[PDB]
Ligand binder design. Structure first.
Ligand code: HEM
Ligand code: HEM
Ligand SMILES: [C-]#N
Ligand SMILES: [C-]#N
Ligand code: NA
Lengths: 128, 132
């Protein structure tokens, strides 16, 4: 865990900072509540197995933020391309992610840091 | 609690000044009495689960006034969008919030300070500029 990683002089990741796997689960869960409640976004997920998605998103965010656990889903570009997702939709989704982090008690500067990791992904996600 | 916050050298907030979570509870309950009695406002809440709304409103006001717990509800812009809420409606709601704070015995100056936090929310909440 973090303790073993610190003994190896490995740096503290965002994942570690925000509370690891348990914190990612809480944040992802709240994230999808918000997204599916947003009448601009919910229809994109009409054909989606939400239980599977949330599992993959937990894995995605953990790995993306420096956690030791693997992401086991499909590439971002392949998944999202063709879905008619615009920069407008991406921004709403990013907004919900920030709200989830805020709701979880993550300091705002760390949320900004997470946005800096996620924002460049708009290339693989969007089409507009 | 405030006792721990002060030992950690965290500052006293507006939340603390008005009596914390317990005070916000009471103000929020009275706030919605006032709102639902206002013929100009009540229809907006037809079919609203008031118990749930009040819980979210307590969270919102506590956090906006510098309290220790995050707001966990939906953001102001999003939740009020598509309802055609005007600057007149918003003014009415703000008045009702101030009257509830008045009724709770919050000093005039502290109510004005709270209104300073709340008035900027008009851009998120309203869709229409009419004051009638
Ligand atoms: C903000 C950055 C985003 C990240 C990190 C992200 C991440 C993911 C992940 C990990 C998956 C699962 C991939 C798999 O099935 O293997 C996924 C699928 C999906 N994403 Fe995103 N996504 C993002 C933005 C968006 C946006 C903006 C939309 C549309 C508003 C969207 C819509 C979808 C949909 C509908 C699926 C499931 C497709 C299916 O039913 O299998 N995503 N995304
Ligand atoms: C003082 C500014 C205001 C604040 C701080 C505020 C706060 C809130 C909060 C915390 C929620 C719940 C969000 C959630 O469900 O997560 C909400 C929703 C709502 N607000 Fe406001 N609001 C304000 C102004 C107004 C005005 C002016 C109106 C219209 C007269 C209004 C009508 C509503 C309605 C109809 C809902 C949805 C309730 C439902 O869930 O059915 N609000 N607001
Ligand atoms: C993808 N959410
Ligand atoms: C709005 N309450
Ligand atoms: Na695709």
């Amino acid at each position: 865990g973090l303790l073993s990683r610190l003994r190896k002089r490995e740096p503290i990741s965002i994942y570690d900072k925000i509370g690891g796997h348990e914190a990612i689960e809480v944040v992802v869960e709240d994230f999808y509540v918000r997204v599916l409640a947003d009448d601009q976004l919910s229809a994109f997920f009409s054909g989606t197995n939400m239980s599977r998605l949330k599992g993959k998103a937990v894995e995605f965010f953990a790995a993306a933020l420096g956690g030791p656990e693997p992401y086991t889903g499909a590439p971002m570009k392949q998944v999202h391309q063709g879905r008619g997702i615009t920069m407008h939709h991406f921004s709403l989704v990013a907004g919900h992610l920030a709200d989830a982090l805020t709701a979880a008690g993550v300091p705002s500067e760390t949320i900004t840091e997470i946005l800096g990791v996620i924002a460049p992904l708009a290339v693989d996600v969007t089409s507009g």
